[PDB]
């Protein structure tokens, strides 16, 4: 009769313990930014001053009529104060003050590769990167005429690979590092607490 | 070999190749976790089920008045995350059955990357293989032409160079498919010079 | 600047910029409400 | 006898399924968005171009040591062919 | 008759159950007080 | 918020007047 109205009660709070658990499990989706793009919401980049990565995307901030918008953002981010506490002198400074601080640092993609191999604790991730920025080259006087053969010899073993592949050697690719369930096994001692008890009183009662 | 006979100089483009004309379900109760939890949660309730000999067992069983409570949860977000993905050139490559350009360095250069083990990023073997079917003397086109000749219809992708990309869904008035994510380089479009 | 001065080789590659960064259970349920408060509920049913 | 416990066991989770289709629709859910910066990230927007803080935010585009990031990103939102298209002459 | 009668608690529940779960995720998704009106109490 | 209650309630009182005209009839047969 009267029995159940107290039980009534204990429903509401019930309710709420359904509720609670249902809410905020959810909201958990800290880092989601894998690109150059996706992190320009992430505050400062760690660059060099005056440098070559520097300069050429200061001469593409200065490039008004295209709408990229990637680019002069993230410089004028880091234009603050004309560049000043914004930048480091070498990419040596730029090691512990990117792991102790809110850097990314900004370099070229074979020295990240480098770098990422060179942490025992291997705590840092490079990104990726597929851009068409710039080439690689190297001088010769004018009057030098061997420039064909020696480019005959590049084009040779990178159109087979080789120059990559040696990279691949000395530099390894394949990574030097790397690259619910909990409240089912948590009844099972409490079921084994559960048939310990039937045992204890199973003696117990054979003794009774 | 047309360096061994004019002087070249640096480049400008990169290139591609391919085939182009046109173009609420249960899974996403398994975004979470899926077909094994499913399996995991059959086995603990016939142990206790074969455990009769009263009330003492039974606060496993009101266990799961919490623990479907947690299986209550977890579903319905799966929408916020976001038919077909697309996603990838490497997605392609589980797709089989896809030709392109022959009689070619397209045709040459990925069965030339076709031979290396230390070459392989698990994509271009595969592909040598996809463009394998009729012993390539049915996979293959030569033109745009034979682009729009070519269907889409059957497990088909999209690619070429860019400036035709641009020209072609251009002449479309779809925009029908997605192109990939890559960047090339090993050849190229240049300048040539002569000695 | 350079290229009037000097001449230059060929490609072998073509530069791209670098960037590096830094590297279910019931812990999930029970981190945003405390495991005390966890206990309170043990306590009006008795 | 046997049928009858597994399809209300099932029926159990296509209305659990249900439920999740039932509360999930108003949860995204007239404009959320009152000011720039925000509405800079929403489709359309031009104005009269040749006004005098169409030069004035422009200079301000070439301010990086003072930006509150909206004044740039609203220029070059109406700065396309030299500030060309989708600029209106007249009220 | 009376299935008519029984059945009603699970049905109209639907709506409580929809209604509380409706409002409960968007709690979460001088800070309130800002005008000089606001301030008069 | 208040624009799924009226129909629950009308609807409420609608299946309880058909079963109300259905069981005063067969009363009276």
């Not at chain 1, 909201?27 to 894998?34: M, N």
């Not at chain 1, 990167?129 to 053969?149: F, T, V």
């Not at chain 1, 559960?194 to 204890?200: G, I």
């Not at chain 2, 160079?161 to 008035?173: G, H, I, P």
Request: hydrophobic residues 45%; aromatic residues 12%; proline residues 2%.
């Amino acid at each position: 009769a009267m029995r159940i109205v107290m039980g009534s009660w204990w429903l509401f709070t019930l309710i709420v313990c359904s509720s609670y658990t249902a809410n905020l499990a959810a909201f958990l989706t800290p880092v989601r930014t894998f690109q150059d793009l996706s992190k320009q919401l992430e505050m400062s980049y760690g660059t060099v001053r005056d440098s070559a990565v520097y300069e050429y995307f200061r001469a593409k901030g200065t490039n008004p009529l295209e709408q990229d918008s990637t680019f002069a953002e993230l410089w004028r981010t880091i234009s603050k104060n004309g560049g000043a506490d914004n930048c480091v002198s070498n990419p040596s400074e730029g090691i512990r003050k990117a792991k102790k601080g809110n850097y990314a640092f900004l370099w070229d993609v074979a020295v990240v590769e480098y770098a990422a191999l060179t942490d025992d604790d291997c705590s840092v991730t490079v990104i990726g990167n597929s851009i068409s920025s710039k080439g690689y080259g190297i001088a010769l006087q004018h009057g030098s005429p061997y420039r064909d053969l020696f480019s005959q010899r590049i084009l040779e073993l990178q159109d087979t690979g080789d120059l990559d592949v040696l990279k691949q050697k000395w530099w390894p690719h394949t990574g030097r590092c790397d690259l619910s369930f909990a409240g089912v096994f948590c009844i099972l001692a409490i079921g084994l607490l559960l048939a310990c008890l039937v045992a204890a009183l199973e003696l117990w009662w054979n003794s009774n | 070999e047309r360096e061994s006979v004019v002087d070249f100089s640096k480049r400008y483009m990169d290139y591609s190749v391919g085939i182009l004309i046109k173009k609420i379900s249960i899974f996403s109760l398994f975004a979470p976790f899926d077909f094994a939890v499913w399996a995991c949660i059959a086995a603990a309730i016939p142990v206790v089920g074969v455990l009769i000999f009263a009330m003492r067992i039974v606060m496993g069983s009101w266990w799961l008045f919490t623990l479907i409570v947690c299986s209550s949860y977890t579903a319905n977000l799966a929408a916020f995350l976001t038919p077909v993905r697309t996603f990838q050139d490497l997605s392609k490559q589980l797709e089989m059955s896809y030709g392109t350009v022959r009689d070619s360095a397209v045709y040459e250069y990925f069965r030339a990357k076709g031979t290396n083990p230390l070459e392989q990023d698990s994509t271009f073997a595969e592909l040598w293989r996809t463009i394998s079917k009729n012993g390539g003397a049915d996979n293959c086109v030569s033109n745009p032409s034979e682009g729009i000749r070519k269907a889409k219809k059957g497990n088909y992708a999209f690619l070429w160079d860019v400036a035709v990309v641009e020209y072609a869904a251009l002449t479309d008035d779809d925009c029908s498919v997605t192109v990939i994510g890559n960047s090339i380089s090993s050849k190229g479009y240049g300048i040539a010079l002569q000695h």
